[PDB]
């Protein structure tokens, strides 16, 4: 599950810089979904949760932004 979080989170951001948005938007939500998923069923410390959390916001922000700009 973890490998999917980064694999999905990496491909998502890779598309953001490349130019893609539709595929990056879907990957963004999916990638972030795995991040919180593992955290919900695997909480070691605060440093780990603090990292995924901060990353979940940045990625989530782009998703909501692209979805808006894409429709607007």
């Amino acid at each position: 599950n973890l490998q999917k979080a980064i694999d999905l989170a990496s491909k998502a951001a890779q598309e953001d810089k490349a130019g893609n948005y539709e595929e990056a938007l879907q990957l963004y939500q999916h990638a972030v979904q795995y991040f919180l998923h593992v955290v919900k069923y695997e909480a070691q410390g605060d440093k780990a949760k603090q990292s995924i959390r901060a990353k979940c916001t940045e990625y989530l922000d782009r998703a909501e932004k692209l979805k808006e700009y894409l429709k607007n």
């Binding site: 939500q29 919180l36 959390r53 979940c56 916001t57 989530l60």
Partner: peptide, 14 residues
């Protein structure tokens, strides 16, 4: 965690 978690549920919903 409450804000980030809610964000996902918001974006991912149909």
């Amino acid at each position: 965690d409450e804000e980030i978690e809610r964000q996902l549920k918001a974006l991912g919903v149909d």
